């Protein structure tokens, strides 16, 4: 029964570390999302194939 209480509380605790790393991952997602914004400001203008049909004809 000590084990039953242990598994109750430790199930709780592993679910809790679950939610904690879940918040870590959610904030990785959101902060890295605003960081996608930050670095996109810098890198999007070149995601393009340019100066191909300029001369070939």
């Amino acid at each position: 029964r000590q084990l039953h209480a242990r598994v109750d509380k430790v199930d709780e605790e592993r679910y809790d570390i679950e939610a904690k790393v879940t918040k870590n991952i959610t904030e990785i997602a959101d902060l890295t999302q605003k960081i996608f914004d930050l670095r996109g400001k810098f890198k999007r203008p070149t995601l393009r194939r340019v100066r191909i049909s300029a001369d070939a004809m």
Binding site: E12, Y15, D16, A19
Partner: peptide, 14 residues
């Protein structure tokens, strides 16, 4: 003359 805490609690507890 006549919420969110509930949901996360459900998660952990179940």
């Amino acid at each position: 003359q006549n919420g969110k805490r509930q949901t996360e609690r459900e998660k952990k507890k179940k």
